[model samples]
Target: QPIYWSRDDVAQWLKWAENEFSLRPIDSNTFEMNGKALLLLTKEDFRYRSPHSGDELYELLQHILKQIRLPAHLRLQPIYWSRDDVAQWLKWAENEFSLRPIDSNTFEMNGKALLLLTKEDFRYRSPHSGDVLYELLQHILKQRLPAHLRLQPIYWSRDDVAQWLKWAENEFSLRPIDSNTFEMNGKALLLLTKEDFRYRSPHSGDVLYELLQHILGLGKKLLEAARAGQDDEVRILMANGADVNATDNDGYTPLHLAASNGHLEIVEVLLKNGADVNASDLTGITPLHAAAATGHLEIVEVLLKHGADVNAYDNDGHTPLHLAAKYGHLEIVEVLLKHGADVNAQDKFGKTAFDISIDNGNEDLAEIL
Candidate 1:
């Protein structure tokens, strides 16, 4: 649905952009960025009313598509499907199969077998029709679809949705809309494939790890890009509003991965965007712990300047120095000592980093500890 912004509102908004954000109008509707015509407005505002000047009606905004960051988000859970999809798929599936709701999530197909099962364990109700379809597609792959069982449809452990999606992709070229989630374009696929169904369900324990953010609606691509030291992708995702400090269920942020991998440039970008330098995973393992333990000296230095806790400890009470000593990270050990790490710090077993000097056999670190 498009909102109506009066012509006055748009003009005022543009003027404000010019004044505040330095967006200069090179011509009329198009604005300039860095001395070039930056904004390219194309869509016709559905709010346009005639009798008013045709130019004045740019105010009635039907859509801007992807011209800028939208205040609204895809009202979806992170998964292969967005809300624009799954709910729509379910509605279509029910109608196609004439599904009947018998329980919270269990549905019967035309008084036959199950039509959709988002839960493989039948742990809970179907998260959404999208999820039901996602699992079904996978389950059906190795087998055949069974017909009615005493007027009940076969318990769908496989077939139906997956066969249809692959068929749609191969035949009509409907495309994997979300890249990973098949999150979008089911609506498109069904139309082309001569069939139908549509759906976002959130992350329950049942959701796979790779599908976490895909289930949450926060993308894994940006996080994956960061971890891989893809600075270009990192910058792009940041520019488009990827959360700088988003943590997965394990509590590892992009910063943790970048620092751990010794990707200085990626770390630089993440840091500039206010990534949580001290963010810890479930084990209290900070990025500093990762850098120091792996002996990435420059990363340790950078993290130190960013106010990394030199004395921070993990669940076992092992400090960065403890790991540095344990791993024979000479430079990292030196850096940690200079950053004011406590030599006397002890693990729950009363093992200080000094224990690693003798036990882990790092003579170089023994002197400092």
Candidate 2:
């Protein structure tokens, strides 16, 4: 399904597209519409916007290339593409040369750029500001602009754009819907929530029951295996139908326990068996949340390496950074900040991690924030 856009988004993109390169505004989400009118970000744009380092558009272009080229064997879920657009795009790279490292983030030919990557060509650092500008690109790529005004601005795959939107809302408490979109002053957005995308992907809205577990057909006593760091018991239970995704009575999953206890082996085993790194407990506490609260740096690293969301929120809107900071976990605070967790994020009562740290009288942690 396509994502809806407020009336403001179309004008924002339309204005930029027209002003920035004699670009044309085309809408492709209509019952029928034109797609070819949309121009892609070719290398020419890179050269034109020399030092495409922090330009929002350039940041967005670089991030998408980084997004597609994840090592599949390292992921909990299978990777797929409607078509290998990135590969097809990169294949054209054989025809051009920039001699500059800038070409890695974007594949170019005749000084033009395309939306793709192969990881080998793209280097990614954890927790980047790249989170700020992809919806606009998604709108541009799928051509889901506001040209029609009767439908959504773009269609996002549940695992791709949809995945990032929820993370952004939690981490920074806002998103760049477009060029004109900016920092929100805490007003609720008219955006879609995870539950809104039911039947879309295997994610958690409420992990209180067996809803998600049942979907994956999980096993029993798995939480114990994780808690005890029993790789053998975990293996046996899994072989005898254990659910790596199952939760205990209080909503804690094996992944949550393994992560909180710093058990790398159990964490690896469960993730490989399809346990979601971002799975939240009753209060929406993800394993990263648990690990951060416990001050387990190695566990945090592993979860992040396997693609744990850096700024996921709990039911009360407390992010992992929030927990780390509130408890005066200095190293954990540094880790989250290093990974790009939002420093300005506020919770239900409008208390940011900085505010919470101060309120807890932990000046040490407050300064870190």
Candidate 3:
């Protein structure tokens, strides 16, 4: 029952830890995690969560574990990690284990779902380093509680909240987030209603409320940020180790959205961070196709420079050149041709870009073709 305490129970334990350690109150609700989740944190994790009081809290954490020490055989075995924990572990594996980029979508499962996966499942989803991932997951599963405990979200991590606000301001088009007063974590923010947000920061709170809704609801922050031209948010997400090439339900990648939306800066950032320029959607439409179709001339040029296929054909056999010519994107057509696009490339209808140009009365593009 002690370990299974709720957030309110954690509130009481916060008081106990503070009093026992003779330390300052870690009063922030951002610090409020369930007791079982809290006990899993290590000394370094405590410091990371609340640098001011975490050092002392770590001592308290150890003491509590020792007082309730159970025989090794009696303690629970499975670690009950949340989705955030899974994501954090995958992110850590990228650098610590020297693995290739693991698609976040593949392991969208929680800790419980993690236990259900076999090596075959891992390999099926992540081909390059599936065996290593399996081994790492085994290592985590076998660890005894409080021995090599994994870290949870520092709900107490205010710097993250501030950074979220700073980055979000650029995306949501808001005034300064006034971080000093609004400093809090997911729990703190979750507790606030829409009215509460509006009541607090009248100028930007409406958007702030919506931002949190997206962050909490969609679970696809990077995709939304890139699609909306949230340049700063994209950088922040990448810095936090978000998978650059992760795809949406429709298989559209961030690169596709950035190119389609004419976000030159976002396209560049995504490429620099290992976005798949040639990545195609469900229908095999590439980023170049989206850019050329939308008449984003600079995006087309940038994508071409980043190794986008000049003659990539979608399901309909339509190449980017076909879209450019059909849409009367004269500059895009010229750029495609310069990049060695085959003028005679035909679509499913057996129509070349030149034919499509002529049919659409795009005489300028037809002349170029």
Number of the top-ranking candidate, with TM-score as the measure: 1
The sequence of per-residue lDDT tens digits that candidate 1 reaches over residues 95-143 is: 4322322132332121111222233323233422223233333433333
Off by over 4 Å in 3: 1-111, 114-221
Cα TM-score of candidate 1 = 0.49
Candidate 2 lDDT tens digits, 80-113: 2212333332332222211112232232111111
Q: The CA-based lDDT of model 3 is what?
A: 0.69
TM-score of 2: 0.41
Task: Give the 10-residue window scoring lowest on summed lDDT in candidate 3.
Answer: 145-154
How many collisions between residues are there in candidate 3? 2
Pairs with backbone N, CA or C atoms under 3 Å apart (clashes), candidate 3 = 30-155, 30-156
Using TM-score as the measure, what is the rank order of every candidate, best first?
1, 3, 2
TM-scores for candidates 1 onward, in order: 0.49, 0.41, 0.45
Model 1 residue-pair collision total = 26
Which regions of candidate 1 are displaced past 4 Å? 1-95, 102-123, 126-220, 248-250
Q: lDDT rank, highest first?
A: 3, 1, 2
What are the Cα lDDT values of the candidates?
0.52, 0.50, 0.69
Give me the candidate number with maximum lDDT: 3
